[PDB]
């Protein structure tokens, strides 16, 4: 654990003290005879890194809604904001991820900054259900199967396998 | 920050959720649709690591007198116990370090585990006061002064610098 230099009040020494672990502060610095005591930040504040400082730092406001914490704050960190899942952050707020239609699919999953990316289903794959989060899947292989194609598939229905 | 797995109770889907970080334990995981909540460990416990906990672990009984706290118990942290400055830890407790007499220096300095180390001054130096701490101190100059040696030093004392 690292070390800082400090001034004791009563004899003008400068003293070499322990530093104090990340989440506490020095609510006594060390003298000739004793060492440094640490303690604990208090509610509402936090430090990140060994410190030799006197208050923690306080945490920021509050994630105005709809944002939510996915860090709080504690000890050992400010709190940090989110948009909550299934909404990205687009300049004040957060919005829906896109939802890609029947016949299209997620090229690129949506993100806390960014909203999905959809592309519309490829050949040989389909999508059938609304969703923000779901790819185009393959056809079932009719071969593979033993069966043959009994009705091809689109983009929004999976090809329907049988014989003859 | 890193990732746990975790068994979803309602639907039995196995999620990868974040860590929360040291300090703090895991109050709510994550499911499909909602980021993990984490909390800040309560007053008496601990955790070191970021982690997916469900309870911080609890901290060490107080220090038995006269050993005292290095590192109090905080969140990050378990409280770590010491011998007081000016004594070493042997067996049982703590002792006070051995006090070098006058003639005697300190060689290697007292810790919180081992006792001081007291030599003989060597020749040209001397010690004046009864020490846990103070070295050896070479004899003033007399050359390097201007001055001569008006009476001799001895391993207590300093030699006396004077003319004629």
Not at 12 to 27: E, F, M
Not at 143 to 153: C, Y
Request: charged share 20%; net charge positive; aromatic share 4%.
């Amino acid at each position: 654990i690292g070390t800082y230099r400090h001034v004791d009040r009563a004899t003008g020494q400068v003293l070499t003290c322990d530093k104090c672990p990340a989440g506490t502060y020095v609510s006594e610095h060390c003298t000739n005879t004793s060492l440094r005591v640490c303690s604990s930040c208090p509610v509402g504040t936090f430090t990140r890194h060994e410190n030799g400082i006197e208050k923690c730092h306080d945490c920021s406001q509050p994630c105005p809604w709809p944002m939510i914490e996915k860090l709080p704050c504690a000890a050992l960190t400010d709190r940090e904001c989110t948009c909550p899942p299934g909404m990205f952050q687009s300049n004040a707020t957060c919005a829906p991820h896109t939802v890609c239609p029947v016949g299209w699919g997620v090229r690129k999953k949506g993100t806390e900054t960014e909203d999905v990316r959809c592309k519309q289903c490829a050949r040989g794959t389909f999508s059938d259900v609304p969703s923000s989060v779901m790819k185009c899947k393959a056809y079932t292989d009719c071969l593979s199967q033993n069966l043959v194609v009994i009705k091809p598939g689109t983009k929004e229905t999976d090809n329907v396998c049988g014989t003859l």
